[PDB]
Amino acid sequence: HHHHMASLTVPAHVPSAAEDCEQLRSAFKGWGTNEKLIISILAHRTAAQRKLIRQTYAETFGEDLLKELDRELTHDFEKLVLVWTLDPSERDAHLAKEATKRWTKSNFVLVELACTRSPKELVLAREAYHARYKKSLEEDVAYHTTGDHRKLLVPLVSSYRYGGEEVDLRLAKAESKILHEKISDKAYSDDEVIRILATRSKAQLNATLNHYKDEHGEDILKQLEDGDEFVALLRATIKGLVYPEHYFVEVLRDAINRRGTEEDHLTRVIATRAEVDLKIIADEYQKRDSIPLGRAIAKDTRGDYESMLLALLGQE
Numbered sequence: 001h002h003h004h005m006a007s008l009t010v011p012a013h014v015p016s017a018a019e020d021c022e023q024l025r026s027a028f029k030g031w032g033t034n035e036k037l038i039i040s041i042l043a044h045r046t047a048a049q050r051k052l053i054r055q056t057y058a059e060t061f062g063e064d065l066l067k068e069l070d071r072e073l074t075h076d077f078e079k080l081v082l083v084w085t086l087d088p089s090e091r092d093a094h095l096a097k098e099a100t101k102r103w104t105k106s107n108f109v110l111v112e113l114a115c116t117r118s119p120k121e122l123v124l125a126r127e128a129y130h131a132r133y134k135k136s137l138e139e140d141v142a143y144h145t146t147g148d149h150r151k152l153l154v155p156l157v158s159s160y161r162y163g164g165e166e167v168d169l170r171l172a173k174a175e176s177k178i179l180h181e182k183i184s185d186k187a188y189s190d191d192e193v194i195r196i197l198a199t200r201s202k203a204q205l206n207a208t209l210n211h212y213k214d215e216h217g218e219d220i221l222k223q224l225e226d227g228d229e230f231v232a233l234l235r236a237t238i239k240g241l242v243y244p245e246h247y248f249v250e251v252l253r254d255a256i257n258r259r260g261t262e263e264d265h266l267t268r269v270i271a272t273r274a275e276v277d278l279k280i281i282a283d284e285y286q287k288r289d290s291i292p293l294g295r296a297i298a299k300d301t302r303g304d305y306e307s308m309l310l311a312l313l314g315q316e
Contacts, residue, residue, distance in 0.1 A: 001046050007279035007314025010044050017056040020045070024053070025061060028068065035077070035304040038069070042085050043311040047275060050085055076263040077305035084271040084312060091272060092117065092125035096137045096157070100144040107149055107229070108236050109268075110141055114156040115240030116247065119163045126157075148189040148230040155198040156237065162201040172207035175200070179208070180216055183223050188231055197237050206242050248273060249284045252293060261300045266309070274312040282313065 002008040015023070020041050027034035042050065057065040066082065073079050083091055092113055099109040114122055129137045136142075138158040145153050175196050182190045200208070213219045224235050239247040248269055255265040273281060285293040294315045298306060310316045 002275065002314075005277040005280050006275050007273075007282065008044075008046065008275045008312065009314050010046055010049070014045075014049065015041075017049075017052040018060070020049075020053050021057045021060060024057070024065070035307070038081065039304060039308045039311055042081060043308055047087050051087060054085075075305070076267065076301075077303060077308060080267045080271060080305060080308050083267060084274070084308075087128070088121065088272070088275065089124040089128035090132065092121070093128035093132050093137070095268065095272070096125060096129060097133060097140065100140050105144075107145065107153060107233055110153055110157060111233060111236045112240055112247075113137075114153075114159070115237055116244050119159075119161045122157070123160055149233065151189055152194050152198070152230065152233060152237070155194060159198045161199065162204075164201065165203045167203050167207040169207055169211070172204060172211050175208050176212040176215070179212060179220065183220070188224075188227070188234060193234070197234070197241070202241055209238070209242055245277070245281055245284050248278075248281045249288070252281070252285055253288075256293075256296050256300055258300060263301065263305065266297070266301075267305075270309050270312050274314070278312075279314050 002010060024038060024041055027037045045053065054065050057063070057068075066085065069078070069085070070082050071078065073082060083094065086094065095109060096113050098104045099106050099113070113125070117125070126137050129135070133140075136158075138154050141157050142150060142154045178192045179196060182188075182193045187193065196208070197205070209220050220238060221235060224231055224238070227235075236247070239250075251265060251269055255262040255269070269281070270278065282293045285291075285296075292315075294310055294313060297309055297313065301309060307316075
């Protein structure tokens, strides 16, 4: 299904599972270059639809669809179809694990993964991460990170926050000060800074920051500007949990350019948000320059990679 926020679009009359398979299967017969058909099917299907596809494709052809379409993962296009076709859970598991290795190390991505998903989601990902790797997302994150970084990161990915909306203004008042005094003391990684940012609900966390911005004046982000990595990680955490849209848009920004485009990050945002809130992220982008994400995307990418992107972006 595609929500008020999602960009993903599916047919009004969707083909059956067996239907998508015969056609998708028939996109591999001898000339292998039927991207358009693959892009037109996979990119216009919901997650539960792609799962049943994947299951019916295995049971009627005895072969694994993904293995069938992960032939050349070095190419942006083929790497996008994978990530995307994947269930949002395995997809996070993959990103989560990639995020903790030498050659693709990003603590920013871990945070993105822990803060910009709902709690249940972070848990179905922790669940995919068991299946796929026989290990914890926090077991690994704990292992591959250290000091301040590890202190903020483990609790972040292992926290399974209340997800209702009820706030507690009284608590929000106090917690906003703990944060403040601690920020001002340069006690950036102080237990109270970490505890508040990693355990409280998204909701509570938001009452906490408004009340912060009035009294104290500036938004909490204005006092966590530069710093080292940990401060930057804090800066990412706050945005992911409370301002997920500006976060993704700043990410699309730093990934799209006339010249050197970071297809890895663009594929990451587009794929992981298309079925969640990319349609709104797209807007926030527009606002900035009145340049549709779609344009900028079509201006600094091409081939099937480009198509696939626009098709996921809810535009073409």
